[PDB]
Amino acid sequence: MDVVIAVGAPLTGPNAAFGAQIQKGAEQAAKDINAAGGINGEQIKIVLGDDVSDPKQGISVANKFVADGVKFVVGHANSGVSIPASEVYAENGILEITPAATNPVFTERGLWNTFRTCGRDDQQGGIAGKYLADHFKDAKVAIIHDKTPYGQGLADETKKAANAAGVTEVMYEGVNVGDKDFSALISKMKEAGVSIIYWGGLHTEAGLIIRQAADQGLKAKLVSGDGIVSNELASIAGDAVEGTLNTFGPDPTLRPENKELVEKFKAAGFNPEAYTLYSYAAMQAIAGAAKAAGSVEPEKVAEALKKGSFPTALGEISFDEKGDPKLPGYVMYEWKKGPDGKFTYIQQ
Numbered sequence: 001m002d003v004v005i006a007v008g009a010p011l012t013g014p015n016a017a018f019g020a021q022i023q024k025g026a027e028q029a030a031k032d033i034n035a036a037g038g039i040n041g042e043q044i045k046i047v048l049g050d051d052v053s054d055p056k057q058g059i060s061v062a063n064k065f066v067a068d069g070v071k072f073v074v075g076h077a078n079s080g081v082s083i084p085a086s087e088v089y090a091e092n093g094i095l096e097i098t099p100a101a102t103n104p105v106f107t108e109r110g111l112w113n114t115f116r117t118c119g120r121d122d123q124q125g126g127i128a129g130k131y132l133a134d135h136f137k138d139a140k141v142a143i144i145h146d147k148t149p150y151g152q153g154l155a156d157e158t159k160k161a162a163n164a165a166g167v168t169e170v171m172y173e174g175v176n177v178g179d180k181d182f183s184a185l186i187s188k189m190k191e192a193g194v195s196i197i198y199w200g201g202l203h204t205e206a207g208l209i210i211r212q213a214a215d216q217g218l219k220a221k222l223v224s225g226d227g228i229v230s231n232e233l234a235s236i237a238g239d240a241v242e243g244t245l246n247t248f249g250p251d252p253t254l255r256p257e258n259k260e261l262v263e264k265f266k267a268a269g270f271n272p273e274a275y276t277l278y279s280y281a282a283m284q285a286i287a288g289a290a291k292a293a294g295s296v297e298p299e300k301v302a303e304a305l306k307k308g309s310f311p312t313a314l315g316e317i318s319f320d321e322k323g324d325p326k327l328p329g330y331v332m333y334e335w336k337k338g339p340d341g342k343f344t345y346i347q348q
């Protein structure tokens with residue numbers, strides 16, 4: 001009987017681009033695995049659930065998945081969605097592997113079922129905070145976050161690391177997801193002589209801040225994290241995006257092993273940037289662990305994930321006892337025009 005694997009992701013709403021990364025990556029992996037014989041001889045059946053980046057809607061999705069006999073979830077994207085959804089899954093026999101949720105809490109609750117293919121924000125903030133001190137030691141820095149545990153969590157980790165390395169921010173402020181007029185905040189930053197804005201949050205608000213700062217005459221460079229790795233950042237911000245910095249893990253589209261896979265996505269009309277191959281890899285981890293376990297039972301797959309190593313589009317993957325992957329860490333990217341003439345994130 002088919003192995004039912006769900007993709008839980010923000011298929012609509014502000015983060016739809018990240019939903020597409022996750023959906024397209026998981027769907028292609030399932031197709032490729034199926035063409036190779038499935039998982040232990042059984043075909044994968046994909047079901048989709050749209051969380052709209054809204055924890056309440058994510059919980060409805062999680063319930064739908066339980067009802068539909070889902071055994072594994074690739075998702076969700078947002079930490080505030082994934083953390084509550086994971087409890088529903090943990091209590092109903094479902095293994096959850098997130099390609100993109102980075103808040104430490106996700107794997108720090110002693111749940112049997114939680115895994116990631118991405119890093120976590122104590123790692124990410126350590127890299128970011130050190131970078132601020134190394135390159136902007138004397139700058140006046142504003143730390144701004146989106147009042148979510150992802151965004152504020154990342155901002156707080158970065159703050160801790162920056163402070164320890166000798167950078168004391170001149171502002172620390174929260175804004176609400178969905179708010180779009182940043183004029184007052186931008187004016188406050190300009191008054192304070194801010195030249196670096198560290199942003200703990202997602203691409204929509206980041207793009208709005210970048211665009212508005214340029215228009216309002218605030219000369220400041222925005223530095224953020226994994227939340228801004230989408231072409232849509234450039235679409236909102238316009239050319240003012242140039243020079244923006246952000247942390248992200250390795251860019252898997254640049255791995256030589258993935259050359260043909262990336263070409264295939266493009267032949268299907270999709271640019272498989274950012275988390276696309278992290279989602280592809282999450283599917284591959286499930287398949288590899290089931291093969292090692294001799295079982296598709298989620299609890300047995302979880303045990304196998306914590307024991308072995310498995311081939312993936314991110315490279316060979318293995319997991320610690322909490323479900324975090326043992327993979328390369330965060331690096332700093334800068335936004336510049338790529339070979340195709342579009343602004344994108346390029347490793348420094």
Ligand SMILES: CC(C)C[C@H](N)C(=O)O
Pocket residue numbers: 018077078079080100101102103150202226227228
């Ligand atoms: C899609 C990602 C930017 C999500 C973010 N890492 C979070 O944990 O909420």
